[PDB]
Every structure is written in structure tokens, then in C-alpha cells.
Amino acid sequence: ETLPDVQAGSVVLYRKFEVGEVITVRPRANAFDIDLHIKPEYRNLLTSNSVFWAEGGAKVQLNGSGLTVQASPLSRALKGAISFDNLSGASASQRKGDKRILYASETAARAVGGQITLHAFDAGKLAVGMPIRYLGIDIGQIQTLDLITARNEVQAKAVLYPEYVQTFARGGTRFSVVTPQISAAGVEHLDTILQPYINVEPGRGNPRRDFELQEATITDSRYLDGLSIIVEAPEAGSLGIGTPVLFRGLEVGTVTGMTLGTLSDRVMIAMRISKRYQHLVRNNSVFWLASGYSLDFGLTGGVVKTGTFNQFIRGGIAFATPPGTPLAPKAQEGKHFLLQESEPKEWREWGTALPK
Amino acid sequence: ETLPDVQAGSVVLYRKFEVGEVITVRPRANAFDIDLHIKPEYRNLLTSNSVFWAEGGAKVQLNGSGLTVQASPLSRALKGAISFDNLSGASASQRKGDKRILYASETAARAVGGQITLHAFDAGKLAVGMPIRYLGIDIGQIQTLDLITARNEVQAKAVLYPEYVQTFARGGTRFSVVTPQISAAGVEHLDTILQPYINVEPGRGNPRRDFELQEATITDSRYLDGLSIIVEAPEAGSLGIGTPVLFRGLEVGTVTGMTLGTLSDRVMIAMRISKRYQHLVRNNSVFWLASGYSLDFGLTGGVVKTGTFNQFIRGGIAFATPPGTPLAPKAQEGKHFLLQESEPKEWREWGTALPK
């Protein structure tokens, strides 16, 4: 479409190496038509599964301390060169269209694989080429942004790399941008100042390939494997996605999502517990809201407790098991509990033996 | 008017490609008169709907890590080149004036379409070329700033791109700049340090094409579709534009705007509720102000509640429905409520069944 590369005479690069030549371009109102020369001993090195991308001029990277000027053929200093490479799923890009298309960047040429669609309410955080990362490892890429004024949403069409398209895009998959959070409590992400991405949490179900972009998503997958109990509450309060679930002050679980009931009288809370602490949850385990700072008072004297709480940052649900000489069976995968509106007075003196 | 491009001999660019030549300029006290050569096989590539823009010298971009020097004809290294392109609505720019005008930048040449006018009280945040963005997608552009000392206001004349001029500019449309907000509560926008823009919320009505620039505007359009009830209060308090409206602690609506009554005894609050939670609002639904931190005290002992509230950030109006064995009908599009001055004591024990 628009490349400042060359009129004629730049070099065809392959894995950043100079073999080939661009011999003819012609401008058009929409898109160039570009003719390349490669050597006859050399035509085996490209096949159907090959993508082409172009760059122009001296690209001085700023990465860390280095400022690397392009050790370039003087062709590229005057007229920007074109690179190419073979890859796995480049056949589907050639099945559409009459011939190959010369992409404007390296990462735009890598965008092959299964193509999903995100329905975001706001594209203020999105960009073309913004990576989709699972556990910090890049699995996908946004390749376009479209505004629809009829349905008030931005449809971002993304691709997933061919290894991950079967494992993801299964429905119940959460997509969310990660924004830098700089507060008085502390900085959470600071790379996302300069390079934002999309965190993704997989799901299990039918291959929908039609998604919406959420607000928050659990970062670590260490709580993905264990049971997913549902906890009923009269109100939400300070509960949110990512709020820790605690046993005796240690973090054993997190709140995955929050929604109302099927009849709107209670807010049910979806939380997951780790595999190591999966056995702590019993059929009789009272839950209560340990949120924020609770300080006491008396008529003859008062004492307070302040503990720089993560509960003050995100109000954590705590639990314990009442003592019984027969132990109740383990809680099932889907089990409904209700909160105690106050902390039980005697759970510090319970000491209920939960083995293994 | 003022371009450092060339005396004679730079190249005419088309989609960043070198076909053509600038053969004659003459200086004048106001504006240059520039004569261009293009090839006779090539004159089909430009028509009436064509805009011209010029740039001068090596433009090293700083975007991210890259510092791309212009892979340029050595003409441009000495004498800056001129580019052009065809587009949709360039006819109206040629209907005015005797001939085409050579713009000083690429984005200034793209400023075509319907021309609105903003009446801002302060141009400290505005600039020429500042984009107007709906849902983060660019729809418009400011092209000039004028100070009037008679009417104490700055008239900024903006353009809207021809796809969006019919959907916007309909009256009841909110324009607002978005400024970076860096506080102890957290950072809200940080791109707008370096690149500010104007958020826009559309409206429905007559094509006014005469606007004023507001202070705050709802960012997301996820609350644009549902009903818009009006809620009456004795005072404003901590209520503002963007304050969430909550059902059982989950956010179901936002306050759109605030104004006084037709006779000044009460402040009425315009709020919109989502489509999913539209059915929760009934004809008997008490509203109360859940703003900030309310802690209790007693003669024999006191207990406090602190919950890192967004209500402390923006004081959210909460609601619930009293129980009745017949359910009242749904609230209409325009319905007037009044706040309860205190929280009802028994809404936690209500549990009013609201189906679907």
C-alpha cells in the first residue's frame, strides 16, 4: 500500500542477509506493484509459505544503552531494503488474494493464524500491532481497529499464532488490556507505560471466536487448576476481581468474577482455590468479609489494630472450619456458600485439624 | 504560506513514492506560488479530489525504540519534497479559492469534511491539529484557534471526517478535552501527557453545528443506550459527572450530568443505567447517597468500616427495591425520583426478587 522502500535497486534480505534485488515498482492510487529478482541457484530458498516485509532507512534502536545504527548496504541507506522469511501458516494469506502482499513491518507480516474478533467498548488503550500475551509469553496480535457507530463498540480483529488457536478461543476466555497502575499504594506495572499488551485467561468450551474485552483479568494462572466455588453475598462491597481469599492470613485463593443472581437479591462471587490448599475447604466452612481496617472501642478503654493490609487494598474473604470430631467431606467443584456478616468470635480458638 | 521545501528540483511524492518534480516557485509577502511537473503517462493519477502537502528535511521519528532517518531521495536531504494523495471530500476545498493550496503537514491536508465551531472558555489545553476521538477512534480535528476579546471566549473551528459528520453534530453532543490526572488515588490517563485529544459523546436532535467545550464527559459508551432517569436532591454534595450508580455494590449506571431545577430549590441529577441492568429500576426504588466513609460509634463500643471506596473517590448513588408481592412496573425513560437523606436500615434484609 505505502512503502518508502525503493524505486529500483535495493536488496532483498533473507534473515537479514543481502541476496536479491528489487528491479521494478510502479505507483498506483491504492497499492504499489513490485517486481523482485532472485538468483537462479537461490530460488529454492522461497516457497508458497513465505511472507515479505519492508523497512526504510537507518533504524536507530533506543533499547537500553545501545543506539545501533543499521549496519546496512548503502542501498538501504538511500533506498530501504526488503526482507523475507519462511514460516508455518503463510498458505492461508496466499489462498486469499491473487498473489503475495508486501507488509509494512516485520510484526505485521508475522500475523498469521486463526483470526478472532474483540468487541471493546473503548479503543483508547488498543493499537494495531498490540501483542496478546499469555503468562507474559506472546501468543497473539491485534491487526486492525474498526469503529462502528450503529452498535456503539470498537471491533478489533486479532490473530492467534497457530500453536495456540486451538487451546485458546474456546469460550469463557477473558481478554483484558493491562494498564500501568501508579498510586500511593504502589506501582503495579511500569513496562506498560511504553509497551501495553493484552492479558488473556483461557477457558473450556465451544470454539466461539467472538469475544468482548473485559476490565480486569487474573494475571497468574496458579489459581486456574483448583475448584471454583460460588459464594453468595448481600452486597458486593470492596470485593473485586483479583481479591485474595485467605486461610489464617495466608493467601490460598482469589476472586475470579462477580455477578448478580438469577433473581436479583444477592451477589454471587466466583472464586478459585489452589491445588495445594484445595483440601482446606469443607462442606461446613463459614466465610466472612475481612475487608479494610476494623478497630475496636470500649467504655473503659479502646485498642486499635492497623496492619498495612492488602485487605485494605482489596478486601479479602477469609474462612475457617468449625471443629467437629467427624470431618465433613470436601466441597464439590460447584458449591454455594453464604457470607457471615461478621467475623466469628471463636475461630482463633477453633484449631480444627485438617490433615494432609 | 510558509514552506521550506524547495526553490526548484525536489520530487513530487505519491504514497511516499518519487514521481514528479517541482520546477518553479516564487516568493510573495503572503504565500508562495508553486509550479509542478508530472509525467504525461502519469497525469491520470491525480484529479479534482486531490490534496497536496509538503515536508522538509530528515524527519527522525522518536516513536518507541526506533529512530528512523528518512530513506529519502537526496533531493529531500537538501530540499524537502512534496507529497500528495487522493481522498473523498477534497472537492469542497477546491470550490473555495482559485486553485489548490499546499498544506504544511499531512494531517492538516486531511482536514476535510463538515466544519463545526467550538466555543471554549480557555484554550490552554487546545492546539491546532488536536484530534477529536470517539471511543478512542479519531473522527475529527481542530484546525484553527481564534481569540475574541469582545465575547470572552476562544472560538476553535474544527472539522469532522465525512463519514461522521451526520452521526455527530446533532445537538446535545458533549465535547471535552481529556487531561492527564495524576493523584494519590492513581493515574487515569498518561498518553495525554504527550498527546492530548478531545473526547466526544454524541447526541440526538437537530444539526446545530455550534458547540461549547464542556469540562467532563463520559468516556465509555456502554451506558449510552439505556434509560435516563432524573434524580432530585437537596444539594449536590460529592456527586459529579462519571460518578457510578450502584446496585448492591456492583456498578450498573453513571451520572451523566447535573443541573438545577426550573425553580432553584433542588439539584436534579441525570443518570443512565445499562441495558443489562435496565430492568432493576422500578417505580418504587428508593435512592440514597452512599458517598465516602461512614463509620459508626456507640456508648459501649464502636466499630468502623473502611473499604478503599470508589465511593470515596466519587460518591456513588446506591439503590434497592422494597419488597412487594405485586411488582411495580418498570420505570419510564424520564422518571423523577428523590434521594433518601439516609440509607434505609432494612435493605440488606429485603431481598426483593427481580427476575430476568
XYZ file of C-alpha atoms in Angstrom:
712
model
C 0.000 0.000 0.000
C 2.506 2.633 1.212
C 6.188 1.743 1.413
C 9.086 4.216 1.116
C 11.459 1.361 0.300
C 12.762 1.726 -3.250
C 12.079 2.710 -6.838
C 14.629 0.140 -8.112
C 17.871 -1.309 -6.841
C 17.526 -2.116 -3.157
C 18.429 -5.558 -1.920
C 16.209 -8.466 -0.962
C 17.112 -9.539 2.556
C 16.780 -13.042 3.962
C 17.318 -13.474 7.704
C 18.945 -10.008 7.427
C 21.189 -11.081 4.542
C 21.647 -9.439 1.130
C 20.654 -11.790 -1.714
C 18.302 -10.467 -4.394
C 17.275 -7.161 -5.903
C 14.151 -5.073 -6.470
C 14.034 -4.226 -10.157
C 10.638 -2.634 -10.873
C 7.966 -0.807 -8.920
C 5.056 1.159 -10.265
C 2.937 3.530 -8.168
C -0.838 3.228 -8.110
C -3.540 5.178 -6.264
C -4.114 2.316 -3.807
C -1.116 -0.013 -3.784
C 2.271 -0.490 -5.471
C 3.092 -3.366 -7.817
C 6.616 -4.573 -7.080
C 8.852 -6.897 -9.112
C 11.751 -8.768 -7.490
C 14.841 -10.555 -8.792
C 16.418 -13.507 -7.004
C 19.276 -15.682 -8.209
C 18.606 -18.986 -10.039
C 20.698 -21.040 -7.596
C 18.687 -19.316 -4.869
C 15.031 -19.840 -5.892
C 14.794 -22.970 -3.731
C 15.023 -20.814 -0.592
C 11.479 -19.454 -1.003
C 8.207 -21.333 -1.407
C 4.450 -20.853 -1.018
C 4.864 -20.453 2.759
C 6.822 -17.203 2.591
C 5.926 -13.685 3.747
C 7.509 -10.413 2.631
C 8.072 -7.248 4.654
C 9.885 -3.987 4.010
C 11.647 -1.297 6.026
C 13.177 2.027 5.068
C 16.376 3.764 6.103
C 18.550 3.815 9.187
C 16.506 2.472 12.111
C 18.350 3.535 15.264
C 17.026 1.440 18.130
C 16.897 3.021 21.583
C 16.803 -0.253 23.523
C 18.594 0.293 26.793
C 22.011 1.869 26.403
C 22.565 0.814 22.789
C 21.884 3.059 19.799
C 22.612 0.653 16.957
C 22.802 2.253 13.537
C 21.876 -0.167 10.745
C 24.993 -1.948 9.514
C 23.401 -1.752 6.125
C 24.145 -1.969 2.447
C 24.376 1.586 1.157
C 21.334 0.670 -0.930
C 19.341 0.678 2.342
C 20.856 3.997 3.435
C 19.480 5.535 0.226
C 16.565 3.200 -0.625
C 15.133 0.892 2.069
C 15.572 -2.862 1.670
C 13.023 -5.703 1.728
C 13.331 -8.838 3.862
C 11.517 -12.156 3.817
C 11.359 -15.444 5.702
C 9.559 -18.763 5.603
C 7.069 -19.712 8.299
C 4.341 -22.222 9.080
C 0.925 -20.797 8.284
C 1.608 -18.423 5.390
C -0.504 -20.519 2.992
C -3.835 -19.001 4.076
C -2.554 -15.494 3.318
C -1.850 -16.604 -0.267
C -5.144 -18.504 -0.675
C -6.819 -15.106 -0.398
C -5.754 -12.524 -2.949
C -4.176 -13.089 -6.338
C -0.578 -13.010 -5.075
C 1.542 -12.125 -2.063
C 1.301 -8.782 -0.284
C 4.302 -6.789 0.933
C 3.718 -5.915 4.571
C 4.913 -2.665 6.105
C 6.628 -4.167 9.162
C 8.097 -7.406 10.444
C 5.462 -7.972 13.127
C 2.638 -7.246 10.684
C 3.972 -9.992 8.416
C 4.089 -12.456 11.323
C 0.331 -12.019 11.919
C -0.788 -15.423 10.666
C -3.142 -17.972 12.127
C -6.708 -18.107 13.328
C -8.483 -14.771 13.312
C -10.698 -13.801 16.246
C -12.668 -10.611 16.868
C -12.778 -8.484 20.021
C -15.730 -6.219 20.832
C -14.361 -3.443 23.021
C -16.373 -0.532 24.363
C -13.340 1.764 24.107
C -10.269 1.674 21.874
C -8.345 4.237 23.913
C -5.970 1.527 25.112
C -5.787 -0.544 21.918
C -3.469 -0.197 18.944
C -2.605 -2.025 15.755
C 0.164 -4.495 16.493
C -0.561 -4.628 20.215
C 0.518 -8.077 21.436
C -1.704 -10.585 23.204
C 0.281 -12.327 25.929
C -0.491 -15.426 27.972
C 1.639 -15.603 31.146
C 3.876 -12.926 29.657
C 4.560 -15.074 26.572
C 3.339 -13.606 23.289
C 0.605 -15.684 21.650
C -1.407 -13.194 19.574
C -1.568 -9.820 17.873
C -4.173 -7.167 17.078
C -4.054 -6.268 13.400
C -6.877 -3.748 12.842
C -9.331 -1.437 14.607
C -12.808 -0.622 13.293
C -15.299 1.854 14.720
C -18.989 1.064 14.302
C -21.367 3.913 15.068
C -24.523 1.793 14.810
C -23.506 -0.668 17.519
C -21.553 1.573 19.905
C -18.413 -0.546 20.070
C -14.982 -0.877 18.507
C -14.393 -4.193 16.757
C -10.722 -5.130 16.998
C -9.784 -8.080 14.815
C -6.889 -10.069 16.236
C -4.975 -13.160 15.185
C -3.628 -16.018 17.254
C -0.493 -17.943 16.386
C -1.250 -21.430 15.006
C 0.012 -23.345 18.043
C -2.337 -21.512 20.402
C -5.511 -21.113 18.332
C -6.892 -24.485 19.450
C -6.056 -24.064 23.147
C -7.458 -20.542 23.303
C -10.594 -19.218 21.542
C -12.677 -21.833 23.358
C -15.236 -19.641 25.049
C -15.135 -18.447 28.598
C -11.839 -16.798 27.637
C -11.127 -13.438 29.254
C -9.341 -10.705 27.309
C -8.170 -7.530 29.026
C -5.637 -4.790 28.484
C -3.158 -4.182 31.283
C -2.658 -0.573 32.189
C 0.080 0.884 34.402
C -1.267 1.481 37.898
C 0.685 4.181 39.728
C -0.836 5.036 43.093
C 0.060 5.737 46.695
C -0.244 2.004 47.369
C 2.484 1.274 44.837
C 3.313 0.769 41.187
C 1.994 -2.458 39.704
C 3.091 -2.371 36.058
C 5.628 0.033 34.617
C 6.654 -1.593 31.339
C 3.096 -0.928 30.114
C 3.858 2.799 30.161
C 5.800 2.363 26.939
C 4.511 -1.021 25.671
C 0.992 -2.115 26.655
C -0.351 -5.588 25.939
C -3.427 -7.770 26.447
C -3.507 -10.357 29.197
C -5.540 -13.457 28.372
C -7.017 -16.217 30.537
C -8.137 -19.381 28.709
C -11.427 -21.212 29.005
C -13.041 -24.556 28.250
C -15.977 -24.919 25.888
C -17.075 -24.498 22.305
C -14.869 -22.610 19.812
C -16.744 -19.301 19.811
C -14.184 -16.991 18.095
C -16.292 -13.947 19.097
C -15.185 -12.119 22.229
C -15.522 -8.949 24.250
C -12.752 -7.156 26.107
C -13.106 -7.286 29.894
C -11.932 -4.813 32.519
C -9.753 -6.970 34.796
C -8.318 -10.473 34.455
C -6.367 -12.721 36.827
C -2.692 -12.370 35.933
C -1.201 -15.587 37.300
C -2.568 -18.995 36.358
C -1.570 -20.557 39.679
C -5.242 -20.490 40.738
C -6.575 -21.820 37.426
C -6.454 -25.520 38.290
C -8.344 -25.823 41.577
C -12.018 -25.863 42.459
C -14.303 -22.931 41.676
C -16.799 -22.365 44.473
C -19.527 -19.731 44.279
C -20.069 -17.536 47.333
C -23.277 -15.588 47.907
C -23.348 -12.128 49.464
C -25.973 -9.452 50.152
C -23.799 -6.758 48.575
C -20.522 -6.535 46.702
C -18.684 -4.097 48.935
C -14.952 -3.862 48.312
C -14.815 -7.217 46.528
C -13.310 -7.224 43.062
C -11.559 -9.419 40.536
C -8.191 -10.367 41.986
C -9.190 -10.009 45.622
C -7.356 -12.681 47.640
C -9.125 -15.452 49.542
C -7.315 -16.159 52.775
C -6.960 -19.001 55.264
C -5.441 -17.800 58.570
C -3.933 -14.762 56.868
C -2.133 -16.657 54.117
C -3.416 -16.292 50.572
C -4.968 -19.507 49.254
C -7.382 -18.238 46.594
C -8.605 -15.319 44.515
C -11.962 -13.949 43.410
C -12.311 -14.686 39.698
C -15.520 -12.845 38.844
C -18.605 -11.215 40.291
C -22.205 -11.212 39.093
C -25.762 -10.986 40.350
C -28.011 -13.959 40.947
C -30.571 -15.353 38.544
C -33.082 -13.373 40.597
C -31.543 -10.136 41.803
C -31.407 -10.484 45.571
C -27.758 -11.425 46.131
C -24.354 -11.009 44.517
C -22.605 -14.310 43.902
C -18.808 -14.384 43.885
C -16.825 -16.825 41.755
C -13.548 -17.716 43.464
C -10.892 -20.350 42.817
C -8.605 -22.010 45.379
C -5.155 -23.503 44.725
C -4.449 -27.210 44.343
C -2.283 -27.262 47.473
C -4.971 -25.643 49.621
C -7.882 -27.362 47.853
C -8.405 -29.757 50.774
C -8.971 -26.962 53.305
C -12.476 -26.171 52.044
C -15.129 -28.293 53.748
C -18.896 -28.567 53.487
C -19.159 -26.585 56.732
C -16.749 -23.670 56.293
C -18.064 -20.245 57.229
C -16.968 -17.364 55.043
C -16.737 -13.793 56.222
C -15.625 -10.477 54.789
C -12.269 -9.356 56.192
C -12.162 -6.032 54.372
C -10.261 -2.927 55.382
C -9.407 -1.705 58.864
C -11.619 -2.705 61.783
C -10.729 -1.052 65.075
C -12.468 -1.545 68.396
C -13.603 0.719 71.199
C -14.695 0.349 74.804
C -16.220 2.346 77.620
C -13.200 1.894 79.908
C -10.587 1.901 77.137
C -10.018 1.191 73.463
C -7.351 -0.535 71.406
C -6.911 -0.486 67.625
C -5.330 -2.737 65.003
C -3.611 -1.414 61.863
C -1.649 -3.779 59.676
C -0.837 -2.150 56.241
C -3.425 -4.574 54.902
C -3.744 -5.883 51.394
C -7.276 -6.328 52.735
C -7.360 -2.543 52.825
C -6.136 -2.570 49.227
C -8.549 -5.351 48.168
C -10.955 -6.632 50.817
C -10.106 -10.279 51.298
C -12.595 -13.012 52.133
C -11.317 -15.200 54.966
C -12.513 -18.610 56.102
C -12.093 -21.297 58.740
C -13.674 -24.639 59.562
C -15.673 -25.183 62.775
C -14.468 -28.123 64.885
C -16.211 -31.469 64.515
C -14.997 -34.912 65.601
C -16.206 -36.289 62.288
C -14.870 -34.181 59.450
C -17.296 -33.138 56.747
C -16.453 -34.234 53.183
C -14.575 -31.978 50.798
C -16.553 -29.332 48.961
C -17.520 -30.085 45.382
C -16.472 -28.215 42.252
C -19.595 -26.070 42.321
C -20.768 -25.317 45.847
C -22.781 -22.372 47.137
C -21.871 -20.711 50.428
C -23.131 -17.546 52.066
C -21.064 -14.976 53.926
C -21.261 -14.456 57.631
C -21.987 -10.753 58.034
C -19.434 -10.555 60.866
C -16.300 -12.413 61.861
C -16.994 -15.377 64.167
C -15.688 -14.731 67.652
C -14.184 -18.151 68.318
C -12.297 -19.114 65.129
C -8.957 -18.202 66.705
C -9.636 -20.831 69.381
C -11.033 -23.462 66.988
C -7.851 -25.112 65.716
C -9.728 -27.584 63.540
C -7.386 -30.350 62.399
C -7.296 -30.570 58.597
C -4.726 -33.245 57.653
C -2.578 -33.828 54.513
C 2.113 30.289 3.023
C 5.445 29.229 4.589
C 7.160 26.078 3.359
C 10.923 25.412 3.471
C 10.538 22.710 0.826
C 12.339 23.739 -2.356
C 13.303 26.504 -4.753
C 13.332 24.046 -7.701
C 14.145 20.393 -8.166
C 12.619 18.398 -5.332
C 10.452 15.417 -6.118
C 6.688 15.057 -6.055
C 5.815 12.126 -3.818
C 2.763 9.908 -4.157
C 2.078 7.447 -1.338
C 5.732 8.167 -0.409
C 6.967 7.479 -3.946
C 9.125 9.677 -6.195
C 7.301 10.622 -9.418
C 7.250 14.283 -10.441
C 9.289 17.418 -9.915
C 8.885 20.957 -8.590
C 10.139 23.301 -11.286
C 9.224 26.858 -10.243
C 8.442 28.691 -7.031
C 8.238 32.406 -6.480
C 8.187 34.047 -3.042
C 5.489 36.540 -2.118
C 4.797 38.509 1.068
C 1.853 36.258 1.979
C 2.103 32.958 0.117
C 4.290 31.163 -2.439
C 3.171 30.311 -5.971
C 4.448 26.844 -6.851
C 4.597 25.112 -10.243
C 4.808 21.315 -10.514
C 5.769 18.882 -13.271
C 4.294 15.396 -13.545
C 4.800 12.885 -16.335
C 2.294 12.617 -19.228
C 1.686 8.890 -18.673
C 1.111 9.818 -15.031
C -1.464 12.654 -15.156
C -4.326 10.178 -14.710
C -3.201 9.531 -11.123
C -4.441 12.925 -9.890
C -7.877 14.502 -10.220
C -10.054 17.206 -8.660
C -10.217 15.233 -5.393
C -6.526 15.557 -4.562
C -4.758 17.376 -1.719
C -1.113 18.450 -1.578
C 1.183 18.627 1.442
C 4.880 19.298 1.916
C 7.613 18.393 4.389
C 11.232 19.451 4.703
C 14.394 17.541 5.520
C 15.259 14.490 7.567
C 12.377 13.808 9.968
C 13.754 11.463 12.628
C 10.804 9.923 14.440
C 11.213 9.085 18.124
C 8.383 6.547 18.278
C 9.323 3.923 20.814
C 12.784 2.487 20.293
C 13.068 3.368 16.601
C 14.843 6.463 15.293
C 14.103 6.161 11.584
C 16.056 8.532 9.380
C 14.216 9.366 6.151
C 15.185 6.882 3.450
C 14.939 9.795 1.105
C 15.974 10.993 -2.306
C 18.976 13.252 -1.817
C 16.719 15.987 -3.187
C 14.794 15.771 0.120
C 18.004 15.815 2.168
C 18.849 19.159 0.536
C 15.397 20.477 -0.480
C 12.254 18.992 1.118
C 9.869 17.002 -1.070
C 6.112 17.355 -1.649
C 3.607 14.504 -1.375
C 0.001 14.149 -2.456
C -2.873 11.675 -2.339
C -6.460 11.338 -3.471
C -9.300 11.282 -0.960
C -13.070 11.567 -0.727
C -14.104 15.095 0.177
C -11.364 17.242 -1.359
C -13.818 18.882 -3.785
C -15.091 21.460 -1.274
C -11.539 22.688 -0.639
C -11.204 23.420 -4.372
C -14.668 25.004 -4.708
C -13.327 27.752 -2.456
C -10.250 29.563 -3.706
C -8.981 29.851 -7.256
C -6.816 26.715 -7.119
C -5.362 24.156 -4.733
C -3.414 25.114 -1.622
C -0.227 23.380 -0.478
C -0.669 22.419 3.157
C 2.197 22.435 5.634
C 1.631 18.945 7.064
C -0.028 15.647 6.257
C -2.680 15.891 8.972
C -3.524 19.470 8.000
C -4.228 18.281 4.458
C -6.515 15.517 5.746
C -8.764 18.099 7.462
C -11.747 17.811 5.131
C -15.432 17.473 5.823
C -18.092 19.331 7.733
C -16.804 22.266 9.737
C -18.105 22.856 13.260
C -17.176 25.539 15.787
C -16.297 25.110 19.466
C -16.723 27.928 21.989
C -14.216 27.259 24.754
C -13.657 29.472 27.772
C -9.946 28.602 27.801
C -7.575 27.496 25.047
C -4.833 26.401 27.437
C -5.497 22.765 26.562
C -6.279 23.191 22.856
C -3.940 23.206 19.879
C -4.101 23.268 16.107
C -4.243 19.704 14.846
C -5.529 18.295 18.127
C -7.585 15.197 17.277
C -11.213 14.634 18.211
C -11.716 10.999 19.176
C -14.882 8.975 19.681
C -14.230 5.797 21.710
C -10.523 6.296 21.085
C -11.057 6.273 17.302
C -10.147 9.509 15.533
C -13.140 11.220 13.922
C -12.232 14.926 13.857
C -9.539 17.577 14.021
C -9.145 21.145 15.273
C -7.702 23.344 12.548
C -7.594 26.881 13.997
C -7.843 28.896 17.215
C -9.266 32.420 17.415
C -9.353 34.712 20.433
C -12.262 37.136 20.706
C -11.877 39.863 23.308
C -15.441 41.165 22.959
C -17.100 37.863 23.841
C -14.642 36.413 26.367
C -14.175 33.048 24.685
C -11.875 31.233 22.289
C -13.582 30.028 19.119
C -11.917 26.839 17.905
C -13.045 25.787 14.446
C -12.883 22.034 13.951
C -13.694 19.655 11.121
C -15.305 16.241 11.189
C -14.499 13.491 8.725
C -17.282 12.968 6.151
C -18.444 9.602 7.495
C -19.090 11.007 10.967
C -20.473 14.486 10.254
C -24.059 13.218 10.014
C -23.916 10.995 13.110
C -22.282 13.672 15.243
C -23.023 17.432 15.208
C -26.648 16.693 16.096
C -27.039 18.759 19.225
C -26.782 17.516 22.750
C -23.237 16.487 21.813
C -20.622 16.859 24.539
C -17.080 17.934 23.678
C -14.320 17.838 26.279
C -10.554 17.687 26.406
C -9.027 14.842 28.387
C -6.232 15.843 30.685
C -3.803 13.531 32.493
C -4.917 13.041 36.086
C -2.017 12.100 38.355
C -3.032 11.927 42.003
C -2.624 9.849 45.131
C -5.686 7.859 44.060
C -3.953 6.825 40.849
C -3.078 7.805 37.307
C -6.018 7.861 34.918
C -4.537 8.944 31.581
C -0.842 9.071 30.790
C -0.733 9.165 26.992
C -2.334 12.625 27.220
C 0.884 13.929 28.776
C 2.453 13.941 25.329
C -0.624 13.792 23.041
C -3.913 15.246 24.314
C -7.196 14.815 22.466
C -10.902 15.646 22.714
C -13.376 13.037 23.866
C -16.816 13.336 22.284
C -20.218 11.920 23.237
C -22.915 12.041 20.531
C -26.462 13.304 20.821
C -29.820 13.149 19.072
C -31.550 16.222 17.697
C -31.270 18.997 15.157
C -27.967 19.623 13.329
C -26.769 22.607 15.359
C -23.074 22.806 14.287
C -22.415 25.323 17.106
C -20.956 23.894 20.301
C -19.242 24.713 23.562
C -16.477 22.723 25.216
C -17.532 21.021 28.452
C -15.459 20.120 31.498
C -16.052 16.363 31.842
C -17.615 13.764 29.551
C -18.443 10.075 29.994
C -15.614 8.095 28.413
C -17.258 4.749 27.683
C -20.465 4.479 25.680
C -21.596 1.336 27.499
C -24.148 3.441 29.412
C -25.358 5.369 26.356
C -28.154 3.001 25.345
C -30.242 2.550 28.493
C -32.841 4.691 30.207
C -32.037 8.165 31.513
C -33.791 8.822 34.808
C -33.606 12.168 36.594
C -32.941 12.129 40.334
C -33.720 15.089 42.581
C -31.531 16.096 45.513
C -31.420 18.951 48.036
C -27.723 19.546 47.363
C -25.059 18.271 45.002
C -22.501 17.078 47.521
C -19.772 14.863 46.100
C -21.797 13.977 43.006
C -20.151 14.635 39.668
C -20.128 13.556 36.049
C -18.902 9.974 35.932
C -19.992 9.049 39.440
C -21.139 5.407 39.420
C -24.689 4.325 40.224
C -24.646 1.078 42.145
C -26.974 -1.836 42.840
C -25.738 -3.958 45.782
C -22.200 -2.656 45.341
C -21.884 -3.508 41.656
C -21.774 -0.650 39.173
C -24.887 -0.505 36.990
C -25.023 3.165 35.978
C -23.285 6.528 35.895
C -24.262 10.141 36.496
C -24.317 11.870 33.110
C -24.900 15.488 34.102
C -26.001 17.766 36.906
C -28.120 20.914 36.862
C -30.519 22.917 38.984
C -34.281 22.724 38.721
C -36.512 25.035 36.733
C -37.098 26.781 40.057
C -33.954 26.711 42.158
C -34.843 24.563 45.147
C -33.257 21.229 44.205
C -30.418 19.833 42.119
C -31.574 17.249 39.604
C -29.145 14.532 38.535
C -29.227 12.969 35.076
C -28.068 9.350 35.228
C -28.137 6.475 32.752
C -28.352 2.747 33.537
C -27.065 -0.115 31.369
C -29.245 -2.282 29.144
C -28.471 -5.400 31.183
C -29.454 -3.757 34.469
C -32.275 -1.676 32.963
C -34.931 -3.960 34.468
C -33.740 -3.421 38.050
C -35.209 0.083 38.290
C -38.824 0.051 39.464
C -41.435 2.709 40.129
C -40.780 2.271 43.858
C -36.987 2.243 44.186
C -35.518 4.421 46.911
C -32.271 6.178 46.099
C -29.732 7.214 48.682
C -26.301 8.802 48.703
C -23.558 6.287 49.503
C -20.704 8.783 49.472
C -17.382 8.488 51.248
C -16.599 6.761 54.526
C -19.338 6.370 57.127
C -18.178 4.928 60.434
C -20.314 4.258 63.480
C -19.937 4.797 67.202
C -21.614 3.589 70.372
C -21.690 4.265 74.083
C -20.487 0.761 74.998
C -18.243 0.296 71.956
C -17.683 1.368 68.370
C -16.811 -0.359 65.117
C -15.761 1.238 61.825
C -15.870 0.299 58.144
C -13.177 1.309 55.638
C -13.205 -0.173 52.170
C -10.822 1.778 49.801
C -14.030 3.064 48.246
C -14.523 4.384 44.760
C -17.413 5.993 46.638
C -14.714 7.901 48.484
C -13.243 8.815 45.102
C -16.652 9.659 43.570
C -19.671 9.400 45.865
C -21.880 6.734 44.359
C -25.668 6.711 44.474
C -26.979 3.299 45.514
C -30.476 1.872 45.222
C -32.677 -1.084 46.100
C -36.316 -2.047 45.676
C -38.636 -2.507 48.677
C -40.409 -5.882 48.780
C -43.926 -6.140 47.391
C -45.864 -9.263 46.394
C -47.024 -7.446 43.282
C -44.063 -5.923 41.498
C -44.364 -2.336 40.345
C -43.931 -1.705 36.600
C -40.593 -0.717 35.121
C -39.593 2.923 35.320
C -40.089 5.014 32.207
C -37.433 6.768 30.143
C -37.916 10.019 32.030
C -38.809 9.469 35.673
C -38.216 11.725 38.665
C -37.037 10.272 41.970
C -35.858 11.933 45.155
C -32.983 10.829 47.357
C -33.442 9.383 50.783
C -31.283 11.549 53.028
C -30.016 8.430 54.827
C -29.519 4.786 53.969
C -32.587 2.643 54.736
C -31.930 0.306 57.630
C -33.580 -2.803 56.210
C -32.440 -3.031 52.563
C -29.893 -5.723 53.419
C -32.776 -7.894 54.649
C -35.156 -7.028 51.787
C -34.040 -9.473 49.095
C -36.660 -8.298 46.619
C -36.935 -10.772 43.748
C -36.306 -9.051 40.408
C -36.404 -11.739 37.685
C -34.824 -11.986 34.184
